[PDB]
Ligand binder design. Sequence first.
Ligand SMILES: CC[C@H]1OC(=O)[C@H](C)[C@@H](O[C@H]2C[C@@](C)(OC)[C@@H](O)[C@H](C)O2)[C@H](C)[C@@H](O[C@@H]2O[C@H](C)C[C@H](N(C)C)[C@H]2O)[C@](C)(O)C[C@@H](C)C(=O)[C@H](C)[C@@H](O)[C@]1(C)O
Lengths: 38, 142, 7, 209, 176
Amino acid sequence: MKVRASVKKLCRNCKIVKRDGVIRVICSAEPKHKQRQG
Amino acid sequence: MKTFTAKPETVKRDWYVVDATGKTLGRLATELARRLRGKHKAEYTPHVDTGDYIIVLNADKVAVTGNKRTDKVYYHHTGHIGGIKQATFEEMIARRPERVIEIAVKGMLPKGPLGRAMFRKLKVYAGNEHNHAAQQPQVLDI
Amino acid sequence: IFSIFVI
Amino acid sequence: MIGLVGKKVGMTRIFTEDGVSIPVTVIEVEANRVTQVKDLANDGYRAIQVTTGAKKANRVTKPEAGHFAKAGVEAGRGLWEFRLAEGEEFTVGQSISVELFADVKKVDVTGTSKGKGFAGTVKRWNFRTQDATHGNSLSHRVPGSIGQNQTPGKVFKGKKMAGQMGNERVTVQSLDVVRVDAERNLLLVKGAVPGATGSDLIVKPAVKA
Amino acid sequence: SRVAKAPVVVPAGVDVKINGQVITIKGKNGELTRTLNDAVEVKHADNTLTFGPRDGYADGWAQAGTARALLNSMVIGVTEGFTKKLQLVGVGYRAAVKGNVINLSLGFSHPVDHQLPAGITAECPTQTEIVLKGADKQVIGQVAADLRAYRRPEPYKGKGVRYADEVVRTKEAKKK
RNA sequence: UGCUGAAAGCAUCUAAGCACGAAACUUGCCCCGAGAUGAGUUCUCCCUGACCCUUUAAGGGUCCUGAAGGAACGUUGAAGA
RNA sequence: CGAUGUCGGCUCAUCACAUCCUGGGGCUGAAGUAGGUCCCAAGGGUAUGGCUGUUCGCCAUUUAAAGUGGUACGCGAGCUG
RNA sequence: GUGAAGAGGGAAACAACCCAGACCGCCAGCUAAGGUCCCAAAGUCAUGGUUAAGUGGGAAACGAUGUGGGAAGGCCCAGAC
Ligand SMILES: CC[C@H]1OC(=O)[C@H](C)[C@@H](O[C@H]2C[C@@](C)(OC)[C@@H](O)[C@H](C)O2)[C@H](C)[C@@H](O[C@@H]2O[C@H](C)C[C@H](N(C)C)[C@H]2O)[C@](C)(O)C[C@@H](C)C(=O)[C@H](C)[C@@H](O)[C@]1(C)O
């Protein structure tokens, strides 16, 4: 998954989630859009 | 005329029992340390142990606040090669729980020789009863 | 010286 | 399980039908007689305490003797404990023979290493030896640098240095058991165990696979 | 809220047995089961259950909402019972079931033999299908999850342990 | 990476709750180790005489006694400066 | 500045992690073999030679790998000079 | 302005910052800065709020349904999201 400092939705299906202390991005269509360190 | 001075040869002392259980570690320590140093009497004598013997039960059941329980550090060094060991709060309570309180007040008793001596008056038992019936320890809150 | 060192 | 106390008589081969030399240390294992049993009641733990040899009466002290007195005496060389684990033994000089290892395939063995007394680095720690030549000035087997500079400004603890070597515990582990021989008190384990000929040995079934 | 605030029927035949914070519920099939709650206030009476915040927990409601939801699946659990349904895909992919252990052949150099936990039982319509019924929703999910894990469906020929309501990727390879 | 799951009728590994998870961590293996002054435990052995003084107390001393054991000495060791 | 021996080698090291190998992962323009990249990981391991004072670098040939740095560019009351 | 040529209290330790200008004695009292749970003198003080991060007790562009407050607006039982 991509790590980055700025994370943001990519597809219309990307979703954004705050798990543990960390901000994330989950895409149900496109694995490339997973993101952490947000 | 010089103001009074406690004298080791004739200090009172007396014993007590305290229940760690729900009590929050440290807010507990405070009073232990205070009572351990004698700061609730004619303490009036920095250079003399005037505190009370006081024993603590259920140290394992001691309480903490915050995410402290899994995040408090507790470090020490073996004096060796590169031997910086550590152990988390829960880890401490797991193996020799009595430690948590012990070090927690040890840090709040003074400095050096006397200080070390004050610490000897505190008996910290993991469990519930204690083999000190003979001292006839009187319970106290806080 | 020388001076030996050288320099 | 438990193990026993023996004496290194030591080292000889035994040849096999299909022509192979099996080097074996020969451990003499006279019967071990339990001098004491220990229990969670008389605090602590579950262990047995054996003795094995034989000792001169005039050498056995009052206490040692009185201790042997409880249970079948005949004071032996010394005493040794083995921790227990759901096996049980009554003290009346139960006597445990080499019988114990008939079915054992493993065995660990512990001696007291031969005494080298000194060594210094090179022998003690396999330190490299400086140029024997090439201008070296009085620094051929010396240890060379032993620290950094100002910033540690000290030598760290456990630095490898010259000093006492050997004449200490050391055990070996694994060691196939080649032969078990009661009414001969022999035990041939395959090859090489620590300590010198004659010295005392403790063998236990191996803790590792 | 909403889910918390909605009620929940207790269909005829079910037990329910609150005791402080410990609900327990028996029905037709199913080993009853028993949850714990915390900043929730569970309220019986009626042919229903109702959940609401307890004074002084800012976490309330969100807690009640879960609580309601959990209890619910217990009712539905111990009554109708819960689903499952996995299917193998890939040459040489067998499944057996001896008693309460699935015997899978998933192209490894050894068997696997996954032992079912407690309140869950398994069947094999074909060598390439596994349906496992059970009451405890949390666990039934887990076991299928475990079963899928032995060979998560790879995206080139879909081979491996599937759900059935799954979606499964599939990408065009691209030699080379 | 998951299961279950609300806050947010949905979705969601998480906020409650549960499962996986690495040569790192705590152990398991080997060695040291009660100066661990927080100086621990267990077994065994040994000593069962008289008498005086003062400011009379963990007081000082006289005669008898000299244990278990230890040490010294000697012959010494695959132990050792 | 009434003196803080300065390059490389040798011997001995010791920490950091921005990880060379080994371990665990996500993504892959991941079929497989095998790569790429990011995340986690510092437990252990981490080349002999030719040339040159070299460090380095080039070259030969290995290896799972031949890691980057701090330590008075570690290491003259240890050696080499 | 201070140190230099100024001690004292505060700033953990810290000429140069903060408070303050030591003629001598005092086991009196009131304050300044700075503080008042323990080391450690003095509030585990009162009332009303905020933060859940050990934030408080190191750092930016930038990222984000963390969370408190305010003004205004859109759609809604002719059924809104
Ligand atoms: C045999 C007997 C002599 O020793 C040698 O000659 C060694 C071999 C010299 O090194 C020789 C060899 C060598 C390499 O120094 C190591 C060379 O550089 C110098 C100049 O002379 C020394 C040490 C020199 O010191 C060095 O002098 C440098 C100026 C500075 C250095 N310091 C910063 C640490 C300092 O130690 C120096 C001056 O002779 C020391 C002074 C006090 C003396 O005159 C004393 C009496 C010496 O003659 C002597 C001890 O009797």
